[PDB]
Symmetry: D2
Subunit: 251 residues, 4 copies
């Protein structure tokens, strides 16, 4: 329905799962997309699977890599013109309690999940402000940004940080009339090939004491809320949290 | 883009402002709509202004009127077939502190804003469960369901009640596999003819200490999040709060 | 330790369970207390069990009874001097989903849990403002004011209302320099003789998927946070939610 | 009133302002206290100002220094016996928007405000679990852990992280019956000599659009909620947020 007419989007971690579904729906709604990922083998195949290079390209990048962020925005503008939309979706997890998190685990996870979002959000504001683009920064901030999980200590830290840092950025962009919105999306458990690779994971996640709907979601569940937030339909939404979680946080 | 293909929606307080914009966008996305309002003069004109009777009709009703709710669902099903979608949007305000709220003011506001939402949500679950409709109940729950305002005491009570009652309903519908989702929408300040009728109101609401964007929203800002929530795009969203407020609650 | 030196407190539903523990600790900290309850047999015994009439008295009252509230404040002032402290603790529950809540059940529960808190808060502001009392209104607002429960629909409505209405009152009292604070306390599951009377209830409430500590609390757990909020120790706390829940809402 | 009978507390950033008031009230309530700070000149004077070495000592430490944390717990146990209580209060601020935060500023602030809290919380769980101490970890998590401020981007990130990381730790300690509680305290604006050193700061913070009480708090306002959380009075409170903010976040 051309809901993203003329938009130019960067999606980090766009080569798999949630990020790939966001990229797919963004292209279907008329956006030009640059997806990122660490593995050129995966990324080259992923871009080609979604569309032609006039619609979607791949840029190899680890979101923790500060200087690569500059190269990524330049490559996207060279391909598609000025960037309007950034989805900070790249993330990793550590399955440790706070008590059992090694400092190396802590720093590695924060480098991707927190520094990556900071670097992308900071650079995005510089590059997308004051251009009449209807710019939108969408930060993936998890149900683990609202509630704790005893075995996700560092992940919880990262997602709580993204949640409130995003409000700061939203406010500064609003008060300065930058034409940049910043919002967070908080997925509950989502079925991906990686969940499928973990025996018993989907069944545990689908128990009513975890997800009240009694099943987990699917990548397009997160793609559709991202289309809304990237579109001009959400021009009055900034500094807000959007939860799509099968009821996980309602109980 | 036919995002509400085959849906049949009731929108309370659908004859003006936010409700009328929700009705307009619902019809544009392929839903059949029954709007309600207290004033037959307003409602007859409003339905005709949006579309033909095959698309949209009006039913006169005060949401505080329990027995009229049954008549409303029957009229909608007679016109359009089984109801899939309920937007509990009808509301009133009292400009009083808790200290200065009369008991008559308290009961009148709660009858519309809280009993109306309860009556609609209860009846909606009975009528829309277990039919494969992809049913969705959307309760208007305000930024005043998140933060207090010293001059909106009864309104705050009503909107806090809608916020958490809606989570209860969401959970019961999820746990029982009813195929009914329940979510809340929380508008910030929105420009309507009624705001326009109050000298200085929009300017006060647009101060940066109130709305960081420095302007208020427009009825379509609430219509678009309602289209998402009424659509099957939001099939994994239940028990969630969706804020569209220009940054009001982010600071 | 005389933490409530000179305070004069009304505790609704003060004759049993949580309310009786709040009354007991208030008297131990030097407050003069008027407890209320519906049953003169229970209330007369309860006051005598805590202390002598110079320390604590009983006033028979249903918190839903608007005109009795005036009589209650007058009786307390006659016994002990001007009221400084109000704990709106009286409440009832209905074990019904929203879907299965009768209108009679809905209205009865809201009359106690919501009208009672409104009547007490409104009257308290009138009677306790501008007297240098360090006045404090503490509204019992439940974990069910934060999360839904599929079988507590009306209770959830009432507790969400108390949560946000209390912020309105807090703000108006702060902005007008009334020397009245308003805060909410949100108990998780608490062991009382009434829980003991329900076979299997404590075991269900103690499951790790409900209360992560693996046991439920005890009335003094709520008494101690109420002493803090009634005391001048909390003179900068207003409009805040205080949760004491064994981790229920943290997951 | 000996509310912290037998407790042994570490307070980071305990040599000034809020931390020094927490230390002062902890000693008055019968706790043995080790305060930390970066400056031996300040810390030696601060410990002596509160009490004698049998009551309170100073240990020089930057909370960002991982290996110093081990030395700090050993010194405290050598002086006073096993540590029961940790207040992670040390923090710094950067007055920059996300847009204008340098990477050096970002990393320095996160090293103190986030790594320091992680290091202290992790080590505290190892050292204070399974000893019958009634152990309590209290993490300073700010009103800036709830709302954004356009000029506190990195600070907001750090305080959001502390808020949700603390819930993870609370849950793991509860589920494993470690006899360790973890909670967060969220001060609003508090008058300290450092605020006094910034011309116009207190007046800006006291505007009704910032702090509804129309004045800022005082260090003892944070000390008293910390006494409650360190005491066995709060034995059912874990994973909770305690806000003391003059109404800042209620509007
Ligand atoms: Mg890849
Ligand atoms: Mg559970
Ligand atoms: Mg918000
Ligand atoms: Mg939960
Ligand atoms: Mg009308
Ligand atoms: Mg939710
Ligand atoms: Mg009684
Ligand atoms: Mg608050
Ligand atoms: Mg120092
Ligand atoms: Mg303001
Ligand atoms: Mg909690
Ligand atoms: Mg606010």
């Amino acid at each position: 329905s051309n809901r993203l007419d003329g938009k130019v989007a960067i999606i980090t971690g766009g080569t798999l799962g949630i990020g790939l579904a966001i990229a797919t729906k963004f292209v279907e709604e008329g956006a030009k997309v640059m997806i990122t990922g660490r593995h050129s083998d995966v990324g080259e195949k992923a871009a080609k699977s979604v569309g032609t290079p006039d619609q979607i390209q791949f840029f190899q990048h680890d979101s923790s890599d500060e200087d690569g962020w500059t190269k990524l925005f330049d490559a996207t503008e060279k391909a598609f013109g000025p960037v309007s939309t950034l989805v900070n979706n790249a993330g990793i997890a550590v399955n440790k309690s706070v008590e059992e998190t090694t400092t190396a685990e802590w720093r590695k996870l924060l480098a991707v999940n927190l520094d990556g979002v900071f670097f992308g959000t900071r650079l995005g504001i510089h590059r997308m402000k004051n251009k009449g683009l209807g710019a939108s920064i969408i930060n993936m901030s998890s149900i683990e940004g609202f509630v704790g999980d005893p075995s996700l200590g560092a992940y919880n830290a990262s997602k709580g940080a993204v949640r409130i840092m995003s409000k700061s950025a939203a406010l500064d962009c609003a008060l300065k009339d930058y034409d940049v919105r910043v919002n967070t999306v908080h997925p509950g458990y989502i079925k991906t090939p990686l969940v499928d690779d973990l025996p018993g994971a989907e069944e545990a996640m689908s128990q009513r004491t975890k997800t009240p709907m009694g099943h987990i979601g699917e990548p397009n569940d997160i793609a559709y809320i991202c289309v809304y937030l990237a579109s001009n339909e959400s021009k009055f939404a900034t500094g807000s949290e959007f939860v799509v979680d099968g009821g996980y946080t309602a109980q």
